[PDB]
Amino acid sequence: PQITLWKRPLVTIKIGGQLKEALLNTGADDTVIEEMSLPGRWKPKMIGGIGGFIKVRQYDQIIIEIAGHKAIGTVLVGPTPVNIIGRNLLTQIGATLNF
Amino acid sequence: PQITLWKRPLVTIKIGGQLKEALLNTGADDTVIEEMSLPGRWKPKMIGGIGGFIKVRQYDQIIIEIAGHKAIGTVLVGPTPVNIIGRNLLTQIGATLNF
Ligand SMILES: CC(C)CN(C[C@@H](O)[C@H](Cc1ccccc1)NC(=O)O[C@H]1CO[C@H]2OCC[C@H]21)S(=O)(=O)c1ccc(N)cc1
Numbered sequence: 507p508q509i510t511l512w513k514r515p516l517v518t519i520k521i522g523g524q525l526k527e528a529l530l531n532t533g534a535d536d537t538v539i540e541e542m543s544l545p546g547r548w549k550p551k552m553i554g555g556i557g558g559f560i561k562v563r564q565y566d567q568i569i570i571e572i573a574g575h576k577a578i579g580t581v582l583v584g585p586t587p588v589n590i591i592g593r594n595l596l597t598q599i600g601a602t603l604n605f
Numbered sequence: 606p607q608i609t610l611w612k613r614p615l616v617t618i619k620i621g622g623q624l625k626e627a628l629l630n631t632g633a634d635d636t637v638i639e640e641m642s643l644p645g646r647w648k649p650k651m652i653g654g655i656g657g658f659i660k661v662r663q664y665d666q667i668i669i670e671i672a673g674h675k676a677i678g679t680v681l682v683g684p685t686p687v688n689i690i691g692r693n694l695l696t697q698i699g700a701t702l703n704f
């Protein structure tokens with residue numbers, strides 16, 4: 507796809523069998539999803555956004571489908587205003603910015 | 606150009622006579638720049654993301670040069686940790702996400 511930016515670049519994702527909406531976010535180093543259950547152990551992470559730093563749960567090697575594209579990588583879980591797909595998974599699906 | 610997302614998509618911008626580095630941010634509706642003076646009227650706004658909200662000044666009809674391409678639109682000025690070029694200006698330079 508070639509996605510223009512007149513609207514939010516929202517796509518459907520699938521994680522743990524569940525469809526969710528998420529924003530493709532070139533401004534995010536990391537993928538951050540709202541509270542949900544994920545398998546395995548997690549490790550601590552602090553991430554800094556516009557308003558300050560927060561604690562999140564870091565899960566590694568999570569299978570996620572993004573707009574029909576398969577990715578396997580790190581997902582952060584915490585109080586984000588919207589689910590965000592960051593560069594760690596945008597690279598896996600081959601996304602680029604073009605102008 | 607085509608910008609890969611292995612690293613943060615940083616570009617040079619010219620705004621208010623000043624060169625700055627900024628992040629191309631498809632996850633942001635509005636452009637937000639670190640504290641600086643801009644001409645004309647403004648009004649206060651609150652914007653929020655991970656870690657909460659910050660108060661900014663909203664300036665309308667500001668010209669920015671983004672990696673060489675001139676665009677005009679609203680610029681928010683405030684204590685953002687990173688200068689961010691949001692969709693409101695990315696659209697004007699014809700930026701798309703491709704995968
Ligand atoms: C949270 C998003 C819905 C919205 N944001 C833009 C977003 O891309 C920020 C943009 C950004 C980038 C760096 C620092 C602050 C904000 N990225 C961000 O918080 O990413 C976090 C997850 O990965 C980590 O990598 C970057 C910080 C972490 S935001 O900065 O909160 C925001 C809200 C409204 C406007 N107009 C502009 C920005």
Ligand SMILES: [Cl-]
Nearest residue numbers: 510511696699
């Ligand atoms: Cl267009």
Ligand code: NA
Nearest residue numbers: 645646665666
């Ligand atoms: Na103005």
